[PDB]
Each structure stands twice: as structure tokens, then as C-alpha cells.
């Protein structure tokens, strides 16, 4: 925040000054600006991509076991989940997708390399 506690009148606040005894937090209204310029240089955060990307994280297969096992584990969680169908969340048809859907993509991106 920024305080400067008093006004001219106001956006013109007015009374307590002439009535004296102005005290408060009294913020000002902040903003700021930069540019699209540094924005790039900022978003430059994250040779490069080719070196940085595909190919740089094509490492998967190292984990295929997990990548399996991760996917493997999904299975169990669900027979469980579905079962409760027989209330509120944990619901029989919820984490199912969010679970078997997280290992679906991450497992397709690797195909790009091969």
C-alpha cells in the first residue's frame, strides 16, 4: 500500500482536514506500467527451445515403469471410487478422469520425440 494521509479537498477527504484531526490508514490507489518490451524479456523467463524443449524433457521412458505404475495405480483408485455409487465428494465418478486423464497426455507428448 501507499499512504499519504490528507487531501487537497479530495478528488475534490475534505471535511476532517478543515475539521482537523486527519488520521487513518488512508491508502492511495496504486498502479504501475512497464511495457511490452520487458514483458518479452520478462516472459523470456519460461539455440534455445530446440535445445530447451522437445528434447529437453523428452526424458520419459526412464520412468515408463512409473509412467506405467502411475497409470497402473490410477486403476485401483477407481474401482474404489466407482463403487461408492452404491452424500458428498470423493464421489464415485470424479477423481476417475482427473486421475486417468493426467497420465493420458503426459504420455502422448513423449510420442512427439519418437
Amino acid at each position: 500500500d501507499a499512504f499519504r494521509l490528507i487531501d487537497t479537498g479530495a478528488l475534490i477527504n475534505i471535511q476532517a482536514l478543515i475539521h482537523g484531526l486527519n488520521r487513518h490508514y488512508y491508502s492511495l490507489n496504486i498502479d504501475y506500467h512497464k511495457t511490452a518490451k520487458e514483458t518479452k524479456m520478462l516472459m523470456n523467463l519460461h539455440y534455445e527451445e530446440k535445445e530447451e524443449s522437445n528434447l529437453a524433457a523428452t526424458k520419459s521412458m526412464v520412468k515408463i515403469a512409473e509412467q506405467y505404475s502411475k497409470r497402473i495405480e490410477e486403476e485401483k483408485e477407481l474401482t474404489e471410487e466407482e463403487l461408492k455409487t452404491r452424500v458428498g465428494r470423493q464421489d464415485p465418478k470424479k477423481h476417475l478422469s482427473e486421475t486417468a486423464d493426467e497420465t493420458l497426455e503426459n504420455n502422448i507428448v513423449s510420442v512427439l520425440t519418437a
Partner: protein
């Protein structure tokens, strides 16, 4: 029309066949009768024997870009499934 089938059948059945047997199969009398066909068929032939070194047409242009595109299809399929992810709207 009969034998062309048999020709393929021999083709299928036989990589190699005696130019006799094929003729015998063709019911031909001259094998040059046969020989024409087989070579019309463009069959590898040495002495006395019709051969099939390639019994089939493999490769030959079209039927491509799909059904054996490795990632491409897969990527298309990705792209597709990604559209199953994208058209998901």
C-alpha cells in the same frame, strides 16, 4: 480367368514352382504358354521353375499418409486426440 487366380494361388502357394507344375496347374501343354503368363505376370523364372521372389505388390505408391504413419498418424491421432482434447469444447 481360372488360372490367373491359380497364378496368384501358385504365387501364394509357391514362391518357386517348377515351370512344369505351374503348367501342369495351368493345364498347359507348352510351358512357353505358361512362360508368357508368368512373365506377363512378371514372375521371376529360372530354368524349369516359375519363381516368386516377391509374391506380392508391396509398396507401390498409394495407401500412405495413414495406416503406417508412425507418430504422424499417432501425432495426427495425438492431434486428433488433442482435438478430442480440443474439440472437447
Amino acid at each position: 480367368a481360372i488360372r490367373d487366380e491359380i497364378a496368384k494361388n501358385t504365387e501364394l502357394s509357391y514362391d518357386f514352382l517348377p515351370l512344369s507344375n505351374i503348367k501342369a496347374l495351368l493345364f498347359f501343354n507348352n510351358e512357353k504358354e505358361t512362360e508368357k503368363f508368368a512373365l506377363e505376370r512378371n514372375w521371376p523364372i529360372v530354368n524349369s521353375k516359375v519363381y516368386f521372389n516377391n509374391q506380392s505388390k508391396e509398396k507401390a505408391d498409394y495407401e500412405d499418409e495413414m495406416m503406417h504413419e508412425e507418430d504422424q498418424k499417432t501425432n495426427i491421432i495425438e492431434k486428433a486426440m488433442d482435438y478430442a482434447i480440443s474439440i472437447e469444447n
